[PDB]
């Protein structure tokens, strides 16, 4: 009679919370989805081993179109868990899933876990200074989306940082790298010329947040556009004007050039 | 020979991640602070049993003035852990402590945990739509902080949601309730008269996120300003322009007035 939305955290099988693991262990059925994000530091096998349960993976279609036929029926007479990378309900469409549960007469509870939205605090950039967030998508066919550029512009105009998620083809396991993101933004800048993203723009790259050895790098596009940030997933941040403490952290912890202490503060 | 910043999560001792527990278990010395937030579902004793270690609690002064004198010295010859509610770097000034660590020749690692910043997802409001965040501070003496009012105004004009962290006076054991925040906001509205926060403003209240039964309520200030949302901690959110699905969730789960479903495109 209960459905548990349980977050798996950021990187590996150990990013689940103690509460989340213990609850997952007591559930009769365990479902999971890895299309919104992928746990780059672990495997389904390792997660299953830790929880000690067989995990049925669901595709985007399974969830978006048939959640009420796959998951909810079982939650009517059993305890069921729905595992998702990060924190549950962060993915835009997941919250609506609780409405579906309600209508099916199923009680639902949310067990939180670390999300990239809060993990970015490791970059030293103040969380309150982040503005609207966006996703950088690959153009294709006659479609060249550029709204993420406008997001950066509006946030930066207000001295706010912009968190940019990069395109992911979960099924095909194809990750957009920070490098590709920068190349795309430079291309959008060449088209809109708003002076929003140029070779002189200061950016921050965070790779493998959650890992004990994440890659946190800060610098100008002209210098980082070809740097090796390691394996995905990658997150790109275009900070607004910096508080001196943010700048000092980027220099001391993220190897940013001393130059940002006078140019971007 | 190392310092770990480990988050404990939102509500109780089980909100810590598995990674964080296993590491905190092997540390020689464990310090902690509980002045940046409130974990309403646990106690120092319960946390100590889980970790199986004695924990030295530090005050804001111990940390801000003597972190390098109390904690770092030990990290040079031992594996030390510094615990904090939620995520250690979110809406705190702890990130700067990593710099002190570097200066002291101590390598540091960050172990994330559920944060109120991403837990807002449980309100049904799309997390990417939140803009600049702010804190509602208790006026002191003739000093009456009002900048948080302008943050709401700025976000609202852009159609973005505004997250409002509420004040805390840990030593005095004072925790600002959503009710007190609303009263302060109405007073600022009276002074500034920007039509930003009135009795007809729609707001969302989230209390004790992380618990299995948090209070999630949405409605007009006139109706919620005197409502009992339960024990602290509380967070206040002033939504911007709502998507239909956000409104649906607020009505179905947060008990919001059905009239909001009728969004004004
Ligand atoms: N479980 C919880 N429920 C509701 N609000 C919470 C909360 N935990 C923290 N807050 C809110 O955030 C404020 C602390 S700000 C520090 C936040 C912390 N580093 C984190 O990652 O969550 C509190 O005063 C309160 O307004
Ligand atoms: Cl293996
Ligand atoms: Na945000």
From Swiss-Prot, chains A, B:
Residues holding S-adenosyl-L-methionine: 10, 87, 90, 115-116, 166, 209, 234
Q: Which family does it belong to?
A: Belongs to the diphthine synthase family.
What's in the keyword line of the UniProt record? Methyltransferase, S-adenosyl-L-methionine, Transferase
Write down the chemical reaction(s) this protein catalyses.
2-[(3S)-amino-3-carboxypropyl]-L-histidyl-[translation elongation factor 2] + 3 S-adenosyl-L-methionine = diphthine-[translation elongation factor 2] + 3 S-adenosyl-L-homocysteine + 3 H(+)
The protein's enzyme class: transferase
* Keyword match S-adenosyl-L-methionine: yes
The name this protein goes by in its record: Diphthine synthase
Annotated HAMAP family: Diphthine_synth
Q: Provide a GO biological process annotation.
A: methylation
Record organism? Pyrococcus horikoshii (strain ATCC 700860 / DSM 12428 / JCM 9974 / NBRC 100139 / OT-3)
